[PDB]
């Protein structure tokens, strides 16, 4: 019935502004209240603000009133960003009902919601990824080995193993973020103890945004 | 901010189960809870508003009860489909506040976490910055603890743990531990252990390397 789509800049520099955008169709956008609700790494859901279709009348959150500015699409503008502010951005519809038997309003519940794009905060460069391997074996049945993918950024790397014909066993960790401002996962395999000394392990990885691509072997120590 | 808290805030379950999470709310909201349904990466869903009344489309088997500061999201015959977090929210007043969620996830037997410690490589080491990682693969249910040990000695601080979604087929979980140490802290210890302790373990169970041999 109804359709949102938001959008933006992926990544803002601190003491910048971040600006999101959301495109509604399916419905007439006059009559209806829109805003903008978001999610931090780690954190819980977080109203911003919601604005009236036809007038732009609305009301944000007032821990982010300061730095906040909704326009009607509507637009989404947060002023002096800091790395707090990475998280993942959703247009809404905001229904309220009248609290009433009197003037009293309800506030803002959210019948439908965009996909959300997500959006970091950070004074990093693109930089692409090193790779290490995670080597241990011939007494356990099975042995793991793995790559370490750290210190590249922005998000994502991919790993393969074997360019992609060694797909049972594998675990590729979510990425964290380091106090350097750098992105760091593991990718893990199990395989037979067997194999090691017959086989080789090569761990693929690709870095799109800095346009690296690195094969490391995973040798026994 | 009225402060909305949800429980528990992980519950196991299995399909065809009846399953009840709670909301409570730090003053009264009147009936004004909504509920939302999360799946990773994908858009929120709205399932309840006005505390009880079913969004549309949304099956029957969930309902939703209270009013006040106590309220209830009540699975009725779990399916596959519902394993997810869920999120209830109040909107009596500005702002609009939510819970932290309470995920759903499935039940299975208990599997002990097979572990492996990983040296740094000698790139790593001529870097200046090593990083040592212990892995936790295919265990359930997820609470497990690692420690980390250097020469016997107890070693806080400079780790972080990453956790991966239950797995599609098997529904265990796999763990890393990494420890990230200066080279000259590295090369000031000799042996390096993690200590794992998890319900299918009787008791902990330690991987451990000598530096350098």
């Known amino acids: 019935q109804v359709q949102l789509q938001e959008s933006g800049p992926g990544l803002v520099k601190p003491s910048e502004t971040l600006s999101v955008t959301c495109a509604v169709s399916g419905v007439s956008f006059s009559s209806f209240w829109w805003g903008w609700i978001r999610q931090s790494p780690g954190k819980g859901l977080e109203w911003i603000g919601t604005?009236?279709?036809?007038?732009?009348?609305?009301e944000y959150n007032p821990s982010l009133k300061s730095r906040t500015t909704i326009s009607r699409q509507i637009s989404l503008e947060l002023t002096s960003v800091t790395a707090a502010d990475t998280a993942i951005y959703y247009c809404?519809?905001?229904?309220?009902?009248?609290?009433?038997?009197?003037?009293?309003?309800?506030?803002?519940?959210?019948?439908?919601w965009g996909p959300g794009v997500p959006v970091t905060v950070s004074s990093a460069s693109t930089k692409g990824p090193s790779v290490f391997p995670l080597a241990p074996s011939t007494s356990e049945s099975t042995a793991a080995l793995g790559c370490l993918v750290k210190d590249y950024f922005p998000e994502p790397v991919t790993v393969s193993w074997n360019s992609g014909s060694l797909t049972s066993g594998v675990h590729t960790f979510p990425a964290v973020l380091q106090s350097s401002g750098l992105y760091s996962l593991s990718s893990v395999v199990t395989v037979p103890s067997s194999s090691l000394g017959t086989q080789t392990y090569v761990c693929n990885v690709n870095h799109k945004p800095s346009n690296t691509k690195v094969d490391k072997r995973v040798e026994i120590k | 901010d009225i402060q909305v808290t949800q429980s528990p805030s992980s519950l196991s379950a299995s399909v065809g189960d009846t399953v009840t999470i709670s909301c409570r709310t730090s003053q009264s909201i009147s009936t004004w809870l909504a509920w939302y349904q999360v799946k990773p990466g994908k858009a929120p869903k709205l399932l309840i508003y006005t505390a009880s009344s079913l969004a549309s489309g949304v099956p029957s088997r969930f309902s939703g009860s209270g009013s006040g500061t106590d309220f209830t999201l009540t699975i009725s015959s779990l399916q596959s489909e519902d394993f997810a977090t869920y999120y209830c929210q109040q909107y009596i007043s500005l702002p609009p506040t939510f819970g932290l969620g309470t995920k759903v996830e499935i039940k299975r037997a208990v599997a002990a976490p097979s572990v492996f410690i990983f040296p740094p490589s000698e790139d790593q080491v001529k870097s200046g910055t090593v990083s040592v990682v212990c892995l936790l693969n295919n265990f359930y249910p997820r609470e497990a603890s690692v420690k980390w040990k250097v020469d016997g000695v107890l070693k806080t601080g400079n780790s972080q743990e990453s956790v991966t979604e239950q797995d599609s087929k098997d529904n265990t979980y796999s763990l890393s531990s990494t420890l990230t140490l200066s080279n000259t802290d590295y090369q000031s210890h000799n042996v390096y252990a993690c200590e794992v302790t998890h319900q299918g373990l009787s008791s902990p169970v330690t991987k451990s390397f000598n530096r350098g041999e």
């Open positions: 604005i009236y279709g036809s007038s732009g009348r609305g």
């Open positions: 809404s519809r905001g229904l309220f009902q009248p609290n009433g038997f009197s003037f009293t309003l309800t506030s803002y519940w959210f019948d439908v």
